Amino acid sequence: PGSMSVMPDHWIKERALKDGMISPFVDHKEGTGVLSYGLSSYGYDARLDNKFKIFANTHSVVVDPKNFSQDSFVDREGDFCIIPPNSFMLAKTVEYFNIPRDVMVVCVGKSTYARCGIVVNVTPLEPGWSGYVTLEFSNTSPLPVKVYAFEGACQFLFFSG
Amino acid sequence: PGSMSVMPDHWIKERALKDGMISPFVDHKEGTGVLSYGLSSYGYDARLDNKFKIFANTHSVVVDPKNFSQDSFVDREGDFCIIPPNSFMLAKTVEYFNIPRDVMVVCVGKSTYARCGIVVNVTPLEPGWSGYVTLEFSNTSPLPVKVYAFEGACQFLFFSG
Amino acid sequence: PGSMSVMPDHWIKERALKDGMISPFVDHKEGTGVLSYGLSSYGYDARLDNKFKIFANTHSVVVDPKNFSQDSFVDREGDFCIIPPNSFMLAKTVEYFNIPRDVMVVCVGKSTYARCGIVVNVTPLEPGWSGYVTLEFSNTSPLPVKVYAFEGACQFLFFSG
Amino acid sequence: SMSVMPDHWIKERALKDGMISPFVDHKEGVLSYGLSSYGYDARLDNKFKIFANTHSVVVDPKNFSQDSFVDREGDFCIIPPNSFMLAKTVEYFNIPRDVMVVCVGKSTYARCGIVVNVTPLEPGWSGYVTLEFSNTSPLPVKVYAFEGACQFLFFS
Amino acid sequence: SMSVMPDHWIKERALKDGMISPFVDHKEGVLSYGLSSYGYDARLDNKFKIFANTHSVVVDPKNFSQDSFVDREGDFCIIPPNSFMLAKTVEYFNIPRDVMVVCVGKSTYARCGIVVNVTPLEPGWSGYVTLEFSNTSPLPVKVYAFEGACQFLFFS
């Protein structure tokens, strides 16, 4: 019922504060440097957490999306991760999301990472979705690219009725 | 005339049934496993068909988007396709689409494939568009990735006035 | 204030002509061949300019998105650029954009390039944004892919209240 | 105990024992072929097998699959970057029970990142030699049929 | 001045001087090992170091890092495409002050794009040999523990 439109900061704020839609929540741009996080005019800039899965071809397995394999990737924890060229990383947002039955959320990159060849490949969060978001960062450059824990990594755009 | 918003399941259903917008059409989630297909709350989960074009550098041609070449790819038919690492595949949806003059359609991936490094690179279907949709699956991982014919492969989101 | 929807050609035209939102501006489809440019029913097809940055691993530097390096790329100028396989290019639009405080702009590819494995990785233009848009074209195919200066390269979709 | 034989010994064995066929007693032709001071430059034939990852198989050396490569026939072959090619020598060899033959590349190809990966021909071996050209450069590289492709060094 | 020695000389040195241990005086077994007419086919042991770019380090040959590779132990190893592997010979070698030893690949592996990149063993060298297998093909390739992997040629 009701078609959906991109919702503004004040709506995102109310849903965060009253309905627990985003937590932790900062109601303004925060953090030092170009990778800021927090509420934006028409979205929310989420942060990368510090646990990464870096994929590599070391074990020569065909990946089956129906059956995850531990040998596709190596676990790293730290203040940054380097994504090897032409590979990808999985990591979680710092923010936990609780998406209402009334809302669908789209994920976009930050230009700071996109202009380095990093493609954020995160499919939409469906109504009712609950969790830390698993960010997938594909490094499409032929060079290793550094990404920063606890800093802005993507923007979520909220569609609602 | 009139700006466009993301349309709900019941609108998608009416357009499918009365205007032939999607065919074949299933008005609910169907199919076994995680790669289900059919109508969703705010979109339609389409299926991969069983004919794939897998790209490879075997013939050393510079690809010219104005002049397609048969030597860029190899044809495969079957119940699954394996996308070689750091390459891509073209395949068609099972569903045929007839998009009204009143509608634009955006294509997104399914998280089951996205978390394996598969980027769906399908540009929007313009008003009046008619056809099976050509799905482009870019494998951004350094490992081969298996994709499944006749199962869900992407979601279409319908924007209308 | 006010949620946002995808705006039609006539709105894009008025903003271009009265508010300088897009310049130069062509109010219809122009140009020879499949890579046309200009106004579309629900967006604007922008053109690639003739200055490209092609990335390569020649100097073995870890890319730091906080600190751009000249050794990550080589400058090319001409009527076309070839994107090496599994790499990317940065180039600017011909069009200059002035995005109102009231508007957010999303960037999508053209199917002519997408079906060759080219992923356009351009994050949204925020309200108030002003500039030529830096296009990032990731070549996800294992073959070099030719892109054409002064012809259509992407579509911008305008969201407003 | 075996040493590298001179041209005159390769000449005698090629003519009197059909060690190399066809045989040319001098450089003919950057991609010359035929008798050298201390070896023999053989020619690339025009049938190639170009390797690619299209079918996502683990290559088993004990069970080598057709889907690992594509067949090509022509005056030249382009080897994809970071891949390899298999092809045969134009020349047929009859290596005596007496001799071992080592294979090296030509500088013209090596300079382009082409590594010839051809293991020694053991005493008594007979056949067209399978040349393996590994392209170690990040660019595709062109190789020429009917022209010099490697040198064999004859130990006896 | 040094020439390639025959089987009988390798036999004598392996038994009377423990040049190769363990030693087998004939081909045992496509992946045979042991004494050949003019050399010795050594066996791959079952411990492997597989290289990968996971940690984004520039390899310094003077300061080689553990994070460049992953350890694997088993009856076989799969070498990732366009990468390499390090492993040791099953055999122990005691190269006399007298001798230099060159290492070549076996045709069964070379044919699959595997280049053996093993530099000569200098006079007086003692040890298990570090084999370096470079996979120049765009496909992963399987290699077999406890079976033939290269040939050594003994110069004296």
Added chain:
Amino acid sequence: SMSVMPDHWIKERALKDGMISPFVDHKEGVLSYGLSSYGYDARLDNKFKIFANTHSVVVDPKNFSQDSFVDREGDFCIIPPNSFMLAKTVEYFNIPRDVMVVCVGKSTYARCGIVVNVTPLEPGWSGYVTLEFSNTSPLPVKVYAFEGACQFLFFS
């Protein structure tokens, strides 16, 4: 018929016939250079050509293009993964009409996936040798100017 010559013969030819210049009669220095028991370890000079696919050209060995590589000068070079480099020896060589010279890698580099792809120097050849280093590892690898880079083995 030609065998691998000892140090004393390389010493005599380097001094009395200017076969190698400059010449050092012993190992100086993991990356030593100079006279070895059965060969000569030459040094990498400090000018490099690093190959990359930036300009999307098919390399023609008969018509080699400047846009295939980038020039670099320095105390070291980093070879991109799965690519190669060209550089010259510090040493100048005057190979007599009498001699053939084979080039092998040093274990310190080979162990890192660096394959030296240098074809034999034919009798009568004169020049600085073009070294071709192919990086077969998935990681960039550092190489050092003015230090040992390969060994030449002299056959006469």
